[PDB]
Amino acid sequence: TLNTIALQLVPPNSDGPDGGREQAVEDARKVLRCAAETGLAGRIGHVMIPGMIEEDPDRPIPMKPKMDVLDFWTIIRPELPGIRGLCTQVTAFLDEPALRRRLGDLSAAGFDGIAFVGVPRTMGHGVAPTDALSMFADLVPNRGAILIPTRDGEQGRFEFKCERGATYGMTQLLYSDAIVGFLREFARRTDHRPEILLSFGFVPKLEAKVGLINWLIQDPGNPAVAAEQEFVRRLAGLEPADKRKLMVDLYKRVIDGVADLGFPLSVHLEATYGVSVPAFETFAEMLAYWSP
């Protein structure tokens, strides 16, 4: 079990002559600075590096190439003394031998958890993500499945992934208490008690203009998600202290709602638009209420 506070850090664009290395160092230093400014120095235990970024097909200008997960960690690891690694990893291009090689490399580099994921919709000889969960379990021994508590059929989908060896579930961004009802029914139906990495994403006013979070959580026809998107739209437009209050209230509703269910809990902090002092001001008040 991780019992950790994880901060998501997206690898920089690698299309420059430095391959993103200067940007990676500055990003790490911005993390330390923002944590220090908000009373969170030394509190973040892990960085969550995604090894997959879904691309919105309707965005006019394309994503640039991104730094490899392990290249990125190698650069930022010296700048974040004491912080360890978590990641997601695409397994579609990793046969069983190559999956053991990648796992050994990530373990040796200091990664403690790995969530196996699929390929973006707009992009094949390896293991399916759910088959990888139980392989070479001594390497990076925290093995993550993605958990979206609003998604149709998620009770049977996530139960199966626990059967196949998931030790933790990394949630989609949480903008309602749907995870409370989900885990209450999961605990009732099953004996599985994976660690839950509860994901919380700061919403700046830029979301009102860009709508990236709204798109990241979209599920057309799902009324529970519609409610979440309405919550995100509301937050985007509220004044800074108002959106902090509402996000902290949501945090408290989730933590209280799941605290007696028997799942180990970690916290996954996300700033989709980039780390900032306002994001960390919100994180700090959340973690002041409850921290793993």
Author numbering: 2 to 124, 129 to 297
Copy text verbatim from the article accompanying this structure deposition.
Methylene‐tetrahydropterin reductases catalyze the reduction of a methylene to a methyl group bound to a reduced pterin as C1 carrier in various one‐carbon (C1) metabolisms. F420‐dependent methylene‐tetrahydromethanopterin (methylene‐H4MPT) reductase (Mer) and the flavin‐independent methylene‐tetrahydrofolate (methylene‐H4F) reductase (Mfr) use a ternary complex mechanism for the direct transfer of a hydride from F420H2 and NAD(P)H to the respective methylene group, whereas FAD‐dependent methylene‐H4F reductase (MTHFR) uses FAD as prosthetic group and a ping–pong mechanism to catalyze the reduction of methylene‐H4F. Mutational analysis of four functional amino acids, which are similarly positioned in the three reductase structures, indicated despite the insignificant sequence identity, a common catalytic mechanism with a 5‐iminium cation of methylene‐tetrahydropterin as intermediate protonated by a shared glutamate. Based on mutational and kinetic analysis, evidence has been provided that all three methylene‐tetrahydropterin reductases have the same fold, similar methylene‐tetrahydropterin binding positions, and the same basic catalytic mechanism; however, the binding modes of the C1 carriers and reductants significantly deviate.
The flavin‐independent enzymes, named Mfr (Gehl et al., 2023), was currently identified only in mycobacteria as a monomeric enzyme. Recently, we reported the crystal structure of Mfr from Mycolicibacterium hassiacum (hMfr) and provided evidence that Glu9 in the active site is the key catalytic residue for 5‐iminium cation formation. Thus, the mechanism of eMTHFR and hMfr is basically identical. Position A contains a glutamate residue in all three reductases. In hMfr and jMer, apparent k cat of the equivalent Glu9Gln and Glu6Gln variants decreased from 594 to 1.3 min−1 (0.2%) (Gehl et al., 2023), and from 18,200 to 71 min−1 (0.4%), respectively. Neither variant showed a significant increase in the apparent K m for their respective C1 carrier, suggesting that glutamate and glutamine bind in a related manner. In addition, we obtained the crystal structures of the inactive variants jMer_E6Q, and hMfr_E9Q to exclude perturbations of the active sites. X‐ray structure analysis of the jMer_E6Q and hMfr_E9Q variants were performed and the structures were compared with the wild‐type enzyme, which confirmed unchanged active site architectures compared with the wild‐type enzymes.
